């Protein structure tokens, strides 16, 4: 984890649209490629689709998941079992 | 080997007794290349045995050694198909080496606390002609005399 | 005047001996008191590379480069010494440094 003397990492080009979709309606889920961004309280209640390498899958953000990364969801590897 | 090795390594005598047998004994008991602990163990065990015996520091040692000392043993020398384990005669240095190795190996297979106590106990038992150490001598002699038919070679 | 230090380094010993002999001789000619060519322990660095283009990690070679050092330390430069050094300074593959 970061040093706490630098703060979380945002990847601004996501922030510039999360700031405009928070107030001017626009409840359409967003399209993004930044799996390395944190979850701020500003995003609460919104839906965002995150690329997993093959196609983006949408998630609905909640309150307890604030502080994690965008990629903590949307798993990449696909496995079912040896059968 | 196929060739012949000539010579023999020389070892310093014991610092506080001047006995090469003590040096060889502590060398055999030495593990990991840590001589100081081995000689500390040997000295503690010897003083305990001397107290429990009433003799000098060497008389008990020689008595215990002479209690467990091979005279003959078998050796698989073979002619014409089968093996025919036969008994042979043992030269003195081999006898001393075997005796000390058996003493130590019996020493390590006991549950008494600390090696020095164990070693003293087994030396005292050998002085009294009992214990696991004497059993090896006895059964080696037994096996050797069982095959006392092919010894013509 | 003061200490004047000359440090000499080269990858070969014959020409370093030649150069130190030449410099001590010219310094003695110009007129001053000089001291011995200190041997100044050498540096050796090794390398180890494997030779096969593809496999066989156990095939390797060892290479090294030696660097020799010599110290002169000419003391009390009387006169014409500095110009003589700045004019008589010729060597191929020899590095030379001078300090005040």
């Amino acid at each position: 984890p970061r040093s706490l003397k630098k703060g979380p990492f945002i990847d601004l080009h996501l922030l510039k649209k999360v700031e405009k979709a928070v107030e001017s309606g626009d409840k359409k889920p967003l399209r993004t490629w930044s799996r390395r961004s944190t979850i701020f309280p500003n995003m609460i209640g919104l839906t965002i689709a995150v690329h997993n390498g093959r196609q983006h899958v949408p998630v609905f953000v909640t309150d307890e998941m604030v502080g994690h990364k965008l990629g903590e969801f949307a798993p990449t590897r696909t496995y079912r079992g040896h059968a | 080997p196929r060739r012949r090795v000539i010579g023999q390594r020389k070892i310093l005598p014991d610092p506080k007794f001047g006995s090469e047998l003590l040096a060889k004994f502590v060398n055999i008991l030495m593990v990991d290349g840590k001589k100081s602990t081995a000689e500390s163990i040997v000295y503690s065990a010897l003083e305990t045995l001397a107290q429990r015996s009433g003799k000098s520091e060497l008389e008990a040692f020689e008595v215990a050694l002479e209690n467990v000392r091979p005279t003959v043993e078998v050796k698989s020398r073979r002619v014409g198909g089968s093996t025919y384990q036969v008994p042979v005669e043992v030269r003195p240095v081999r006898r001393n080496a075997l005796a000390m190795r058996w003493i130590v190996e019996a020493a390590r297979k006991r549950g008494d606390k600390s090696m020095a106590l164990r070693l003293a106990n087994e030396l005292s038992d050998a002085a009294e002609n009992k214990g696991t150490a004497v059993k090896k001598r006895e059964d080696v002699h037994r096996m050797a005399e069982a095959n006392k038919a092919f010894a013509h070679y | 005047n003061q200490r004047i230090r000359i440090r000499l380094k080269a990858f070969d010993h014959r020409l370093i001996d030649q150069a130190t002999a030449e410099i001590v001789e010219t310094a003695k000619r110009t007129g001053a008191q000089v001291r011995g060519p200190i041997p100044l322990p050498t540096r050796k660095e090794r390398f180890t590379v494997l030779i096969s283009p593809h496999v066989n990690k156990d095939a390797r070679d060892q290479y090294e480069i030696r660097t020799h050092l010599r110290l002169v330390d000419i003391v009390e430069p009387t006169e014409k010494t500095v110009d003589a050094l700045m004019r008589l300074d010729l060597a191929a593959g020899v590095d030379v440094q001078i300090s005040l």
Binding site: - | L12, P15, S36 | D58, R60
Partner: protein
């Protein structure tokens, strides 16, 4: 006047000065038994004396550097033996037989390519 000797071992060197006094085993400005941990080192350092002129008319100002315990003890013994040679020239006729004159030249080997140590090679369990 005093006399000199030099002993060497695995990686140790010894400077020995001998003077006709009665008992002086200073080593690096320290006494013998305090410098050397209680072990056979004291036996080996006093060994080349008890057979000739058993530490009566002698002073043993000693300096040592490099190596470990046993190396330093052996180097000291070699230096002391060598120093006595320039005291009486007839002492060779016994020190030679004692074996203290010869300089031991055993030291560690290289680590060679493809081996874990000087001679230990990786386990060979190939079929």
């Amino acid at each position: 006047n005093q006399y000199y000797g030099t002993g060497r071992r695995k990686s140790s060197a010894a400077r020995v000065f001998i003077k006709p006094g009665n008992g002086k085993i200073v080593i690096n400005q320290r006494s013998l038994e305090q410098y050397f941990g209680r072990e056979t080192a004291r036996m080996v350092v006093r060994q080349p004396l008890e057979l000739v002129d058993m530490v009566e008319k002698l002073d043993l100002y000693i300096t040592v550097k490099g190596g470990g315990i046993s190396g330093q003890a052996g180097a000291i013994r070699h230096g002391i033996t060598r120093a006595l040679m320039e005291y009486d020239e007839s002492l060779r006729s016994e020190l030679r037989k004692a074996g203290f004159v010869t300089r031991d030249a055993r030291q560690v080997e290289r680590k060679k390519v493809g081996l874990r140590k000087a001679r230990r090679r990786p386990q060979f369990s190939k079929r």
